[PDB]
Amino acid sequence: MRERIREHLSSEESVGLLFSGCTGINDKTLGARGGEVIMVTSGSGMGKSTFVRQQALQWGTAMGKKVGLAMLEESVEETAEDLIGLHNRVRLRQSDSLKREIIENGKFDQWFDELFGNDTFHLYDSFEAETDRLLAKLAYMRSGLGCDVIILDHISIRKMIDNLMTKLKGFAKSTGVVLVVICHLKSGALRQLSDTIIALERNNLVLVRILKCRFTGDTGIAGYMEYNKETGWLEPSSY
Amino acid sequence: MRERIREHLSSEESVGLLFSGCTGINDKTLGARGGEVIMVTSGSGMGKSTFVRQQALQWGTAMGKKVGLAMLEESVEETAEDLIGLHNRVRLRQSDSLKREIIENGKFDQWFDELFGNDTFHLYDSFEAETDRLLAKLAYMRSGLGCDVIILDHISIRKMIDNLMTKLKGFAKSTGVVLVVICHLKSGALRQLSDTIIALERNNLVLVRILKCRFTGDTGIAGYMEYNKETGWLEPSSY
Amino acid sequence: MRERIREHLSSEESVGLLFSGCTGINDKTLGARGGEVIMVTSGSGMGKSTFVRQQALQWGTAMGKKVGLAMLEESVEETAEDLIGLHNRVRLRQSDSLKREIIENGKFDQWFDELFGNDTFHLYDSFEAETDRLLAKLAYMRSGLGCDVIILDHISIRKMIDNLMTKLKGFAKSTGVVLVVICHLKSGALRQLSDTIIALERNNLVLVRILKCRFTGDTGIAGYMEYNKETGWLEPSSY
Amino acid sequence: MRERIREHLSSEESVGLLFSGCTGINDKTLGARGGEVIMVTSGSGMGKSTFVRQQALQWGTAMGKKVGLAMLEESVEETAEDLIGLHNRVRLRQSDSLKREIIENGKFDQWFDELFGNDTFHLYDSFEAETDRLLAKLAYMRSGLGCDVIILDHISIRKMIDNLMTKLKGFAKSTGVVLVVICHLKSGALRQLSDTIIALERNNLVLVRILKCRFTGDTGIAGYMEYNKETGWLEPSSY
Amino acid sequence: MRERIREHLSSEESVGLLFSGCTGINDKTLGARGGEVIMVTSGSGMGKSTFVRQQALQWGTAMGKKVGLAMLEESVEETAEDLIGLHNRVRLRQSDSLKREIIENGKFDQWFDELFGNDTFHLYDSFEAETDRLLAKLAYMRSGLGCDVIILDHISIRKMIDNLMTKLKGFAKSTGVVLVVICHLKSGALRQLSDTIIALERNNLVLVRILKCRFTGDTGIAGYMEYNKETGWLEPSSY
Amino acid sequence: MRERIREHLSSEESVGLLFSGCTGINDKTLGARGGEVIMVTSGSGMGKSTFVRQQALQWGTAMGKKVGLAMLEESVEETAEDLIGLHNRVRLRQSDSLKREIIENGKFDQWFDELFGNDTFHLYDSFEAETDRLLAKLAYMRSGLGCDVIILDHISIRKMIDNLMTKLKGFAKSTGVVLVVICHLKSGALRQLSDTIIALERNNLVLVRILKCRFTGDTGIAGYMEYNKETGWLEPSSY
Numbered sequence A, B, C, D, E, F: 001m002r003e004r005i006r007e008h009l010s011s012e013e014s015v016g017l018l019f020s021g022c023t024g025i026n027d028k029t030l031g032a033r034g035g036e037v038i039m040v041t042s043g044s045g046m047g048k049s050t051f052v053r054q055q056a057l058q059w060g061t062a063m064g065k066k067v068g069l070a071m072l073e074e075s076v077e078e079t080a081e082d083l084i085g086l087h088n089r090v091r092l093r094q095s096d097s098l099k100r101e102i103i104e105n106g107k108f109d110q111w112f113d114e115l116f117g118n119d120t121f122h123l124y125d126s127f128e129a130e131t132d133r134l135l136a137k138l139a140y141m142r143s144g145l146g147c148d149v150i151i152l153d154h155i156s157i158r159k160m161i162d163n164l165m166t167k168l169k170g171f172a173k174s175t176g177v178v179l180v181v182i183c184h185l186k187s188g189a190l191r192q193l194s195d196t197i198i199a200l201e202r203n204n205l206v207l208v209r210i211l212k213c214r215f216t217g218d219t220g221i222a223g224y225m226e227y228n229k230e231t232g233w234l235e236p237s238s239y
């Protein structure tokens, strides 16, 4: 047992992928570990996507991880637009002007390559009510595209949901990828199968509440973020 | 994806029909886009109709758009009276004198033609508690009369309301028309199905609050307007 | 629509029964129209009755309208006494002397006939907590006595009040009579069902505040009146 | 109605018990009528008691009315002392000398009989925080002792006060006695239930302010009185 | 009541301990009665202490009363020094010479015995912010030392002050001792709980103003005193 | 019977192994007696393991008892890690840093020996759906390893469960060991065969509810504990 515990102690990854933008999230969660499913929730339009997109951007650009993004609602172009804008601290969607300027200026092409040049991000859309068709694509993003993190955006709150979540967790646990699923709050396996659940609350000062973190057991409010309506980034707040 | 994003970027209508009279509304909303439902609310007699009528007048006269107005409460004659007065910066209802003068003077006929001469405005009244009868007329105002904007005045705050709002949003999203619905605040799908919600607050200095704007996410108070009791127009305020 | 709007324009009664004694009331309200309920309020002993009685006297004497007065608190004799005194610019209640003089002098009889001779005023008292018994009498004062205006004095600030106000407005709207209700301020449907609300404020210089006027939307203070403790009349003030 | 109004006019008591000492009080109030509650107030030691005692003395001696005095604070002996002194234009309390002289001289006995000989005044003390015990005694002073006026001295500014005032007014209104209550100002039903409120103001020149008079509506300052420190009487002032 | 009033009249102490030095004080106050609290006030160094000390000296020497003096600021020795000097019409504090002469001359001892020999005066110092500790000592000076008058020197202008004054008045009223409290003017219960308030005003010609006297109601200026800088006595002035 | 009852009275173990950390548990249970099965339950991640591990640590270190721990879910290394951290008031799992520091520093080895040096704790993992294979190991931990207490972590809520619980209780009753079984609440013999059932409730303030205690019959809430997220210990709370 002695040598058995030692090797155990010197090989256990307690700290996972670090989150960004919210002083406190890491304190209460220790980051996202591989094999865990991260649930991010809150009311519609409350900021789930942005928050997750922001983490996706950092993990993939700063942490050198390959991120896969599977969109159920919006298209790749839309997601790409958001990612590109985010990376350049600008909101492409909110400005027909900048959008047209970026094409002729040749900045779009430069921006596209600066972000997607390498094989870091993998965006997939076109996701029917079939779990198995979905799981197959997820597993390919892992095995074939070597994604470290896979974000699933998104799902709405049971057989279906239950079986999906059960298949999602199994997939996560067996491959060791980090799965972050965004879900809308307008449930059962949701709370059970998820390892960590993050909820965003508002009323641009967003309160980040840790509804659950298996690994740490530390729940409660992690901190506050402030949305910069100009850059589109969620920033840490001195609240 | 590159060429896929490019065409996406050079074909996305971010800025919709511009609002008028309130320095700030456009800043926080980017105008009214086609396919979206605009909710305008506030207490009774607080100024919803006027505000919407004013936007209707500009969109149809200045923007060259065809506007349809479906009245559930008041009649066409009443609405027309308001539109005509508005256009001529005069309050016909508040003056038996001007009303009688306008007939003999021949100005009424001249004013009527100057406003309704073209096929720009389409007023319909005579709207029973049947949604389907209503939706049918709306769809005709779009397809048959080619309205760019349809204003529904009005509705009072669930099956009925819920199904109506769900049918209204579906209609809006599928045709691409801009639907602005006025509703009284003395709800469920109301907040959910609406893309942008504008609330007017008073105590003639009216505060315009953006309760919700999907497209932009920018909420809060857009600005202040001042009602000119002489012309009947809501004017921008230096508050 | 053209000919439809024309006839509409040349048949709309914008200006109703003109108020008297307060330079400004008419400006902000355009008078009392038939079918509307006028609410007159303020603290006890603040002057509601006098003010309304004064309007009643003018409408019935000068405007040639038949006025019905339904008293819930005071008796017909009391009301009559006030009306008679008002008409003769004298306060009968404040002088046992004049009261006794008026009988022997034969002036009372002359004064009574000069005011009540014709069928202009209809005073009814003896109004139990039954709305339906009340509404029945009101409807008779309209249909049977042909009253143009009916004053209800008075009511104290909900089922009861709510249902009463809802029945009062329905009665007013359906018959087209002008209903002026006096209410004490020491509410719900009160503010909602009332078309115009007039509030009197003091500390004999009375401030007349227009708390609400559907038809015009013009609110605020209409002007100031001065109570003549000698004649009992509320007079216009140069404040 | 004619004969109904006539009898009404020739049977209405507008002028009540006349006040004394203050040229103007009667002008603004028309005296104290039966069934009304008179509130007399002002700061402690400002002169309420004296003023009321003075009215009590006149009503009972000159007007031939039976006056009941219910004291909550001071004793009968004290009150009697004040009444006796007042009647003889002398301040018994301020002079041990006169007090001792009046006994041997036989004047006390003569003075006592000259004031209390008849059954005009009824002094009662010994008034616990029980309203019902109080009301019972009041009703007896009316029915049993036939008092025309009952003075309650005194009360300090709510259930208790509210219920008391409500019971006081009910008692007054139902029996027709004149109730004058003295209250200290260092309120709710006080202002509401009282028919006339008299306030005394100083800095021996006392300003008499009519804070309220239902019957007449005439408020404001009635006049000025001057306290004669030698006789103890409040006299009319030429201010 | 007759015999009840008689005994009342022949047992009422209207005239209390007579004041000295100011022709007029007694006229407006009738002296200090037992059970009353006398407030003596004015600006610092204006002469409160002297004035009160002077009254204390007379009451105790001439009137044969036992006087207790409770000092909050100065010590017993200081107070004694002032009393001794006062009694001998000399200012001990202003003369190191006389002070040294009085010891050897044996006059001090003779003067001490001539003043304090009997058990007439009781000086106590050493009075912490505790009311209850203070009240206990006061009650002992009354009950145990049999003081007729207790002077409290002094207090500075609320819970504390309010509760103290309320406890002081209660103590005074319940025992019947005469309490004279000196207070500094640089309030609430002060004016209320005090029975008589005397204020000294200057610019050695001191104006004595009676700010309040419950018992008599006679306020205003009582008279003028002149300070003899040689004897330390306040003398009556012919102003 | 007399001598029969006496020896019975002087040989009955009413108080068993005392629990720790929760002021009240012992009051309502009198501790854990040999031959009884203790059920500890609550929702997942609610704190069962920690609580039991804490009791295990004390029983084995302070009470000098030999504790056996049979893990069905986690491994020995994991359990050992928790025990070691607990003993040193530190959370090894939550800190890659401390984990690496403890190896080189030589503290791990020192900590391991300080806890496991003696033959006090017996951890066994690797527990298939076979009851009989399980019971065999349990019986060996008792007979062969001489464990006083055996903790079974854990079981999820019937033949299987029923037969297992029936075999567990039989084992406990026949050997006299103290068996504490942890079970998840997301039943039949569970409630029946268990002698004492402890439930933990949260929302780090944990409510300890005694759902059942045969021996005492005292049920209800024993008290509150507070989780120290820094040391990993459940502490008594002053709630």
Ligand SMILES: Nc1ncnc2c1ncn2[C@H]1C[C@H](O)[C@@H](COP(=O)(O)OP(=O)(O)OP(=O)(O)O)O1
Pocket: A214, A215, A216, A217, A218, F042, F043, F044, F045, F046, F047, F048, F049, F050, F051, F184, F202, F204, F205, F206, F226, F227
């Ligand atoms: N009361 C508590 N407050 C906060 N965190 C706690 C508390 N109790 C335990 N934890 C933390 C420490 C662990 O990392 C995590 C889970 O505790 P644990 O005892 O393993 O729960 P459990 O045994 O009831 O659940 P399960 O076996 O079902 O996963 O949460």
Ligand SMILES: Nc1ncnc2c1ncn2[C@H]1C[C@H](O)[C@@H](COP(=O)(O)OP(=O)(O)OP(=O)(O)O)O1
Pocket: A042, A043, A044, A045, A046, A047, A048, A049, A050, A051, A184, A202, A204, A205, A206, A226, A227, B214, B215, B216, B217, B218
């Ligand atoms: N905290 C915030 N403050 C202000 N605007 C925000 C905030 N977060 C996001 N937004 C803006 C940017 C977007 O245009 C819009 C919606 O954000 P988004 O992340 O798409 O919400 P969501 O993903 O939670 O909602 P849903 O998927 O349900 O529509 O609002």
Ligand SMILES: Nc1ncnc2c1ncn2[C@H]1C[C@H](O)[C@@H](COP(=O)(O)OP(=O)(O)OP(=O)(O)O)O1
Pocket: B042, B043, B044, B045, B046, B047, B048, B049, B050, B051, B184, B202, B204, B205, B206, B226, B227, C214, C215, C216, C217, C218
């Ligand atoms: N801001 C304003 N200040 C003053 N008057 C106004 C204002 N807005 C509108 N009005 C006037 C003009 C109209 O005669 C009247 C009512 O306006 P309107 O737009 O019809 O209110 P609304 O549509 O919100 O109420 P509703 O439908 O519930 O009766 O008040």
Ligand SMILES: Nc1ncnc2c1ncn2[C@H]1C[C@H](O)[C@@H](COP(=O)(O)OP(=O)(O)OP(=O)(O)O)O1
Pocket: C042, C043, C044, C045, C046, C047, C048, C049, C050, C051, C184, C202, C204, C205, C206, C226, C227, D214, D215, D216, D217, D218
């Ligand atoms: N503005 C005024 N100034 C002075 N006296 C007034 C004024 N208005 C009315 N009065 C006088 C005349 C009446 O005798 C008395 C009460 O007037 P009244 O109209 O009966 O008040 P009100 O109807 O508001 O009160 P309520 O019904 O609650 O008793 O006061």
Ligand SMILES: Nc1ncnc2c1ncn2[C@H]1C[C@H](O)[C@@H](COP(=O)(O)OP(=O)(O)OP(=O)(O)O)O1
Pocket: E042, E043, E044, E045, E046, E047, E048, E049, E050, E051, E184, E202, E204, E205, E206, E226, E227
């Ligand atoms: N009227 C006066 N004219 C001149 N000197 C006076 C007069 N009264 C008192 N003094 C002198 C004697 C003392 O040495 C000094 C202060 O008198 P004192 O009675 O102690 O004042 P005070 O008691 O009002 O003030 P405090 O307690 O606030 O210091 O002034």
Ligand SMILES: Nc1ncnc2c1ncn2[C@H]1C[C@H](O)[C@@H](COP(=O)(O)OP(=O)(O)OP(=O)(O)O)O1
Pocket: D042, D043, D044, D045, D046, D047, D048, D049, D050, D051, D184, D202, D204, D205, D206, D226, D227, E214, E215, E216, E217, E218
């Ligand atoms: N106007 C006055 N001027 C001077 N002294 C007056 C005046 N009125 C009354 N007094 C005197 C006579 C009394 O001895 C004393 C108090 O009068 P009193 O009527 O008892 O006051 P009050 O009844 O208002 O006060 P309270 O009941 O609160 O003590 O003052």
